[PDB]
Design an enzyme around this catalytic site. Structure first.
Site, PDB file in Angstrom:
ATOM      1  N   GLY A 135       1.138  -1.696   0.094  1.00 35.04           N
ATOM      2  CA  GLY A 135      -0.029  -0.099   0.025  1.00 35.04           C
ATOM      3  C   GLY A 135       0.796   1.557   0.162  1.00 35.04           C
ATOM      4  N   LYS A 136       0.481   2.629  -0.806  1.00 35.54           N
ATOM      5  CA  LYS A 136       0.956   3.567  -1.126  1.00 35.54           C
ATOM      6  C   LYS A 136      -0.209   4.652  -0.983  1.00 35.54           C
ATOM      7  N   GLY A 137       0.475   5.605  -0.104  1.00 35.38           N
ATOM      8  CA  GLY A 137      -1.169   6.486  -0.314  1.00 35.38           C
ATOM      9  C   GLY A 137       0.171   8.094   0.225  1.00 35.38           C
ATOM     10  N   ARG A 138      -0.680   8.957   0.354  1.00 31.32           N
ATOM     11  CA  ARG A 138      -0.296   9.922   1.099  1.00 31.32           C
ATOM     12  C   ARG A 138       0.052   9.696   2.657  1.00 31.32           C
ATOM     13  CE1 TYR A 139      -0.175   3.678   4.037  1.00 29.00           C
ATOM     14  CE2 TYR A 139      -1.909   5.081   2.576  1.00 29.00           C
ATOM     15  CZ  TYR A 139      -0.842   3.868   3.026  1.00 29.00           C
ATOM     16  OH  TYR A 139      -0.466   2.807   1.928  1.00 29.00           O
ATOM     17  N   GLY A 140       1.614   7.553   3.855  1.00 31.23           N
ATOM     18  CA  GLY A 140       2.916   7.223   3.707  1.00 31.23           C
ATOM     19  C   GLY A 140       2.721   5.540   3.071  1.00 31.23           C
ATOM     20  CD  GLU A 141       6.543   3.616   0.723  1.00 34.02           C
ATOM     21  OE1 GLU A 141       7.328   3.151   1.425  1.00 34.02           O
ATOM     22  OE2 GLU A 141       6.651   4.299  -0.065  1.00 34.02           O
ATOM     23  CG  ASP A 164     -10.903   7.352   8.377  1.00 30.46           C
ATOM     24  OD1 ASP A 164     -11.767   7.685   7.471  1.00 30.46           O
ATOM     25  OD2 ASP A 164      -9.447   7.589   7.987  1.00 30.46           O
ATOM     26  CE  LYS A 204      -0.247   4.696   8.822  1.00 28.06           C
ATOM     27  NZ  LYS A 204      -1.978   4.779   8.978  1.00 28.06           N
TER      28      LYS A 204
HETATM   29  C1  LIG Z   1      -5.335  -0.333   6.899  1.00 30.86           C
HETATM   30  O1  LIG Z   1      -4.477   0.446   8.240  1.00 30.86           O
HETATM   31  C2  LIG Z   1      -3.539  -0.514   7.719  1.00 30.86           C
HETATM   32  C3  LIG Z   1      -2.707  -1.847   7.263  1.00 30.86           C
HETATM   33  C4  LIG Z   1      -2.353  -3.346   7.650  1.00 30.86           C
HETATM   34  C5  LIG Z   1      -2.393  -4.471   6.811  1.00 30.86           C
HETATM   35  C6  LIG Z   1      -1.890  -5.038   7.469  1.00 30.86           C
HETATM   36  N1  LIG Z   1      -2.552  -6.805   6.786  1.00 30.86           N
HETATM   37  C7  LIG Z   1      -2.118  -6.970   5.501  1.00 30.86           C
HETATM   38  C8  LIG Z   1      -2.663  -5.760   4.843  1.00 30.86           C
HETATM   39  C9  LIG Z   1      -2.406  -5.740   2.882  1.00 30.86           C
HETATM   40  C10 LIG Z   1      -1.996  -7.302   2.018  1.00 30.86           C
HETATM   41  C11 LIG Z   1      -1.485  -7.092   0.865  1.00 30.86           C
HETATM   42  C12 LIG Z   1      -2.478  -6.446   0.407  1.00 30.86           C
HETATM   43  C13 LIG Z   1      -2.371  -6.830  -1.098  1.00 30.86           C
HETATM   44  C14 LIG Z   1      -1.186  -6.380  -2.077  1.00 30.86           C
HETATM   45  C15 LIG Z   1      -0.983  -7.012  -2.817  1.00 30.86           C
HETATM   46  N2  LIG Z   1      -2.629  -7.751  -3.267  1.00 30.86           N
HETATM   47  C16 LIG Z   1      -2.566  -7.205  -4.261  1.00 30.86           C
HETATM   48  C17 LIG Z   1      -3.216  -8.744  -2.680  1.00 30.86           C
HETATM   49  C18 LIG Z   1      -3.177  -8.173  -1.054  1.00 30.86           C
HETATM   50  C19 LIG Z   1      -3.345  -5.192   1.048  1.00 30.86           C
HETATM   51  C20 LIG Z   1      -2.657  -5.623   2.263  1.00 30.86           C
HETATM   52  C21 LIG Z   1      -2.389  -4.140   5.441  1.00 30.86           C
HETATM   53  C22 LIG Z   1      -2.504  -2.804   4.379  1.00 30.86           C
HETATM   54  C23 LIG Z   1      -1.237  -2.645   8.344  1.00 30.86           C
HETATM   55  C24 LIG Z   1      -1.532  -1.361   9.048  1.00 30.86           C
HETATM   56  O2  LIG Z   1      -0.471  -1.093   9.509  1.00 30.86           O
HETATM   57  C25 LIG Z   1       1.287  -1.936  10.005  1.00 30.86           C
HETATM   58  C26 LIG Z   1      -2.244  -0.319   8.457  1.00 30.86           C
HETATM   59  O3  LIG Z   1      -1.968   0.414   9.363  1.00 30.86           O
HETATM   60  C27 LIG Z   1      -2.607   1.104  10.989  1.00 30.86           C
END
Ligand SMILES: COc1cc(-c2cncc(-c3ccc(C4CCN(C)CC4)cc3)c2C)cc(OC)c1OC
Ligand SMILES: COc1cc(-c2cncc(-c3ccc(C4CCN(C)CC4)cc3)c2C)cc(OC)c1OC
Ligand SMILES: COc1cc(-c2cncc(-c3ccc(C4CCN(C)CC4)cc3)c2C)cc(OC)c1OC
Length: 287
Positions: free
Chosen positions: A14-20, A133, A34
């Site tokens: 994930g990538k956005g204005r918040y970071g990655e 949010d 994050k």
């Molecule tokens: C919303 O916020 C937060 C989320 C997470 C988080 C935790 N587990 C898994 C994910 C993730 C993994 C994989 C994919 C996709 C990318 C590849 N493909 C297309 C299928 C799968 C999407 C999402 C995330 C983003 C962690 C955070 O903090 C460390 C967050 O912030 C609090």
């Protein structure tokens, strides 16, 4: 005592204005990392302050591992480390996946369970917490078919950031600036509005009588991408529009019950909206 702090960053998810956000590895195990932008440091501080106050532990809250601040030559690096959910966000999951009655109910009851856990004050325990949010991108899908709620960067706590919520999901009292900002219950009622929108996003992907709707975000038919505050206020406050309930839902007892639940999350009057606990009870009596 060796303190192994090295995390291998493997892939950006994930990538956005918040970071990655990165999938990382610690001691052979996946973690989610994050990395905050300078723009959104206050979200790291608020999530860290909350977890320093109460170590939340709940199957439907994204699991906290660590908050790290590291000094760099010219900057501060801020990381939040959590459990990793390889199936990704509910937003991601709903794009291609359709649901049956059991999987739809399990998703929405797990979200209600996480949200009720946030909202309730426990004595001994935890302060009451409002998310502020809630949306499908801030919900992760677990392998066991339940979800968990993520991102407490805007959370507010009660006992006794210049970031604002995602505009598409803002309740009418936020858009018309009538919310009673000194009243904790106000923030719970904003979360219930947003929950109702998430319920709608999920219910659309539940198959009945061979029919399903395509994934769309709330208000896809009445606002642009990246809708303005004014775009949202005109829809939600001035015209008092609500998401469409398709006719095909009224042939299915589950979707009929979910439509009634959505309606009771979307009242203009915040104090008329259902509580998270009443949503859970209603969901446990469906099917
Ligand atoms: C919303 O916020 C937060 C989320 C997470 C988080 C935790 N587990 C898994 C994910 C993730 C993994 C994989 C994919 C996709 C990318 C590849 N493909 C297309 C299928 C799968 C999407 C999402 C995330 C983003 C962690 C955070 O903090 C460390 C967050 O912030 C609090
Ligand atoms: C500082 O930084 C990071 C540390 C770690 C980490 C690595 N090994 C061991 C630990 C550990 C836990 C707990 C104790 C207890 C046991 C003895 N006593 C009763 C109180 C103290 C000691 C050591 C930690 C916390 C991981 C990190 O990332 C996942 C860290 O960076 C974010
Ligand atoms: C931050 O995260 C993780 C940390 C660890 C971890 C590493 N070393 C030591 C510990 C530990 C040992 C003992 C105590 C307590 C137990 C007895 N009590 C009465 C006082 C002291 C606390 C902590 C931990 C928990 C492992 C993890 O995963 C397997 C972590 O998750 C990624």
């Amino acid at each position: 005592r060796t303190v192994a702090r090295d995390i291998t960053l493997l892939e950006c998810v994930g990538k956005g204005r918040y970071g990655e956000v990165w999938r990382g590895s610690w001691q052979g195990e996946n973690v989610a990392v994050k990395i905050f932008s300078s723009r959104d440091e206050k979200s790291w501080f608020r999530e860290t302050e909350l977890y320093n106050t109460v170590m939340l532990r709940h199957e439907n809250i994204l699991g906290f591992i660590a908050s790290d601040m590291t000094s760099r030559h010219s900057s501060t690096q801020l990381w939040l480390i959590t459990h990793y959910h390889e199936m990704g966000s509910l937003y991601d999951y709903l794009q291609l996946t359709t649901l049956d009655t059991v999987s739809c109910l399990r998703i929405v009851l797990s979200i209600a369970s996480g949200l009720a856990h946030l909202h309730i004050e426990i004595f001994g325990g935890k302060p009451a917490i409002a998310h502020r949010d809630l949306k499908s991108k801030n919900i992760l899908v677990k392998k066991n078919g339940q979800c968990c709620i993520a991102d407490l960067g805007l959370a507010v706590m009660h006992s006794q950031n210049p970031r604002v919520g995602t505009k598409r999901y803002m309740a009418p009292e936020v858009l018309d600036e009538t919310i009673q900002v000194d009243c904790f219950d106000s923030y719970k009622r904003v979360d219930i509005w947003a929950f109702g929108l998430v319920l709608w996003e999920v219910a659309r992907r539940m198959v009945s009588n061979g029919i399903v709707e395509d994934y769309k975000p709330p208000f896809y038919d009445v606002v642009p991408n990246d809708p303005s505050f004014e775009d949202m206020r005109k829809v939600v406050c001035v015209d008092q529009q609500r998401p469409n309930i398709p006719n095909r839902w009224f042939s299915d007892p589950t979707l009929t019950s979910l439509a009634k639940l959505m309606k009771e999350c979307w009242y203009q009057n915040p104090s008329a909206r259902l509580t998270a606990l009443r949503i859970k009870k209603t969901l446990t009596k469906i099917d």
